[PDB]
Design a protein around this nucleic acid. Structure first.
Ligand SMILES: [Cl-]
Ligand SMILES: [Cl-]
Ligand SMILES: [Cl-]
Ligand SMILES: [Cl-]
Ligand SMILES: [Mn+2]
Ligand SMILES: [Mn+2]
Ligand SMILES: [Mn+2]
Ligand SMILES: [Mn+2]
Ligand SMILES: [Mn+2]
Ligand SMILES: [Mn+2]
Ligand SMILES: [Mn+2]
Ligand SMILES: [Mn+2]
Lengths: 85, 98, 93, 108, 96, 78, 105, 92
DNA sequence: ATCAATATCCACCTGCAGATTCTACCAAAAGTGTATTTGGAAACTGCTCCATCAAAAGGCATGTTCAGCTGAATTCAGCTGAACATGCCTTTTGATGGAGCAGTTTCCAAATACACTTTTGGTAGAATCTGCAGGTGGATATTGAT
DNA sequence: ATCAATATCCACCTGCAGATTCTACCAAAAGTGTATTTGGAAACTGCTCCATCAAAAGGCATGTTCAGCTGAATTCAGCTGAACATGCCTTTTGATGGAGCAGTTTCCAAATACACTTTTGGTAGAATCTGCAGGTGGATATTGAT
């Protein structure tokens, strides 16, 4: 068995989810172009974090990304995350 | 006359609601797929601890919420109540993300 | 397999401070992360302090200076009080 | 031999002095570690933990709850100037945010 | 009598000071300020001259960067004049 | 009264190097406040380093270390 | 007698880098290849910055690189500017840059 | 006796620009730069070895640290130069 | 727009002070040769988690309609901030003289490291204990039409 | 000003998933004795700093004049929020099978340890020759009539 190939999943970050995120951030009104911009920003952020996490995984000679790989990658960007040690 | 709230009232209710709670706001399985697609483009046949995907989602949502806070301040600074891409761009520029 | 953590000490301090309060496992995880983070901040600054002044040994003085460098104004004074007190008690015992 | 006494109890501490000493020894911080350094560090870690638990338990009681959850820790940190400064670049999983609506967005 | 129009000399000064690298605060006032502030943390201090020079380089670089961000904030609001609220927005976004 | 030694023309030159064309009259005092906070923070840490080394003379390296602690690495004074 | 720098074809000092690794409270042990690798990386970065800064100095009709040339070299290169994003260069100015909306008519 | 990278920076300068000099302040800038990058790479290598319960810092930790600390293309070139130097040193 | 008047900036120059480069001596650091130890890789397993799929109900995404309120565009006056002349006060530059602090070396008590042995606190997993989610129902505050 | 509609706020309740307590083993901390390192006091030196005085230029403070920018007021097309039908895709719980992570043993390449030799990098003064005042001339840009 194998996963069918993953494609175009940045669109899973839906307009309602982006709206909810903005709401938690105190935003009352959203221009129509915000959603694509947010998707681009999120994709860059997630790419950077995952690249560093996978670098940690490959240095450990592992094939499984761990929570600690992600934590080290986030600290790596000056974003200490609590709760996954 | 069927009842209608005025534009902005439900948005303020939603602000209060989501600022009161802490649950993740992106659907979990689609975010999982996004994480695995991106990681697959760096190294093939990777596996993930479930807590690793959850750590990624917590970090991403916290980042986006903070970014939206700064974006909102940038929009209000320009005498608007509507966030626009250039607000996000100014917030990221000042933050040092560019 | 043996995984160590600060959980039992966090819980003792919690019962000390709020005798009738508990803590969820996720909140305990945040607490463990907090303790390890602060440990690394203080210990790393103490290491750098000893290195700058060409000392082989990290002493309570390096720890104290690191605490003063890490903490905002008043918390620093409070922490210094508790650390100094602990060291003097330990030395007399 | 004499009766075994832990360094934590000699120092009057709840946090473990021996474990902190070992972690200092093995963390490649210095060639040598003084006898008082793990005592001091364990005391400081215990004190900071006590402060955050005090404020988080108060927040939990205000919400009529017995058990501290991450939201209460987030409340305790973000409502305290010096704790919020210390943990400025820290993300608390499942903490959410403080209620804050910019005045200009309220209805007129 | 010849007069340049409002803004022409300001732009000339922008070009001039962006071309050069010398410190822009007078040295003696900065020295005096540094020693006054330091006295409130620990008494009877001395300073290496290079320490004061490092402090001044750091302070001026900080202020120049802050003014860049402040300028972007002012332009964002469709103004060309920086105001205290621009500095406040820039420092808030910066995390200060 | 030494913060007033930071004169309006000096603050204006700083703003010019930052690309500022027009300056409101309230900027200068605001800048002074900002500058004071900045200097205080840096100097505090620097003196702590000086005090840890059992010295009474603040060195360039004390300032460099204080600036690094604050995430503002300075080159040129090692 | 041949130095390890020369065995590695390097100008930066392999022996000094090895000693600084040993003495920096980094790890209990340092392998033989690590100081070679690190010294090579440091030499490469130094060569890039000196290449670009020397170009700036030649364009300014000057024999000697000064901090301004280093600032130009760093800030005009995307990846160097990213690497040194939070670094202040003493007596390094800023890049000439005037926001378009401020230019006359 | 105070050490610095001055003579090595100058050798590389002569390699890259044989007729170009450097001012004292710029040499200070370069010394700060070299020490900064040294600390960045060595600290990340230390953390890497510690995370994986290894006593030794090897060229592998240095390489991974370079991939982590340096932006994209610079990282590739630095890795090329490091591996190149290590193989040359091993054959010598 | 052109055309004159006016101001500023840039490239060049020379003379020469000062900064950098060159040179030679030497204490300290790197290299060498040899001996010896050891961290960690390789091989071998045994479980732990992960990948992927399956089912089913319901929560949520999507597209659509319609209208309110916002962003965008425009105008314009008053008040602020720029530009500039004038005069003076602080900063700069330079010179002198000491006190005081930063370093340096050394020697012994005191402190810390480390092997071996004893003791117990900390942990994993089981057994027990429980608060709070997740329902209901009613009171109350807010919102918007009229 | 009311009054309907709707959301939000509180109080109640119980069962079970999640948290806490219990239990016994053992890895790690503590005790002991011995070996090794170090911190600091006691003098002593020699640079750096600080204090102090003095003149002068150069930058700053001040006042005046006015251009032009900011903030206010106004208007309007259309974008975005609110509400709803529709339907699907996420969520939750579990099964299957194996990939891969983790524990264990064995041994060698690679690391450390140590005595001694060779080389180097730092330093201060001499020798070299670049960069900076302070001038010019020409390029370039600004400003005001027209
Ligand atoms: Cl936009
Ligand atoms: Cl100690
Ligand atoms: Cl303002
Ligand atoms: Cl190696
Ligand atoms: Mn792909
Ligand atoms: Mn072994
Ligand atoms: Mn409007
Ligand atoms: Mn027991
Ligand atoms: Mn409930
Ligand atoms: Mn297998
Ligand atoms: Mn030599
Ligand atoms: Mn000139």
């Amino acid at each position: 068995r194998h996963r069918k190939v993953l494609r175009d999943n940045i669109q899973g970050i839906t307009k309602p989810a982006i709206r909810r995120l903005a709401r938690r951030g105190g935003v009352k009104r959203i221009s129509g172009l915000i959603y694509e911009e947010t998707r681009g920003v999120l994709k860059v952020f997630l790419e950077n974090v995952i690249r560093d996490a996978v670098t940690y995984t490959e240095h450990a000679k592992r094939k499984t990304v761990t929570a600690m790989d992600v934590v080290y990658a986030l600290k790596r960007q000056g974003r200490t995350l609590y709760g996954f040690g | 006359k069927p009842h209608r709230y005025r534009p902005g009232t439900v948005a303020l209710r939603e602000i209060r609601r989501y600022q009161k709670s802490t649950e993740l706001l992106i659907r979990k399985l689609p975010f999982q797929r996004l994480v695995r697609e991106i990681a697959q483009d760096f190294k093939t046949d990777l596996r993930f601890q479930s807590s690793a995907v959850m750590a990624l989602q917590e970090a991403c949502e916290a980042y986006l919420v903070g970014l939206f806070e700064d974006t909102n301040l940038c929009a209000i600074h320009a005498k608007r109540v509507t966030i626009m891409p250039k607000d996000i761009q100014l917030a990221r520029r000042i933050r040092g993300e560019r | 397999s043996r995984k160590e953590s600060y959980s039992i000490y966090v819980y003792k301090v919690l019962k000390q401070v709020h005798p009738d309060t508990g803590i969820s496992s996720k909140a305990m995880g945040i607490m463990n992360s907090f303790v390890n983070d602060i440990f690394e901040r203080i210990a790393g600054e103490a290491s750098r302090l000893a290195h700058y002044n060409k000392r082989s040994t990290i002493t309570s003085r390096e720890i104290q200076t690191a605490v003063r460098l890490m903490l905002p104004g008043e918390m620093a004074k409070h922490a210094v009080s508790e650390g100094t007190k602990a060291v003097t008690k330990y030395t007399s015992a | 031999r004499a009766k075994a006494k832990t360094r934590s109890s000699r120092a009057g501490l709840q946090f473990p002095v021996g474990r902190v000493h070992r972690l200092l020894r093995k963390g490649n911080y210095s060639e040598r570690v003084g006898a008082g350094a793990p005592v001091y560090l364990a005391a400081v870690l215990e004190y900071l933990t006590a402060e955050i638990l005090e404020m988080a338990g108060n927040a939990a009681r205000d919400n009529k709850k017995t058990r501290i959850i991450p939201r209460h820790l987030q409340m305790a940190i973000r409502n305290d100037e010096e704790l919020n400064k210390l943990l400025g670049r820290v993300t608390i999983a499942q903490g959410g945010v403080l209620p804050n609506i910019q005045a200009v967005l309220l209805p007129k």
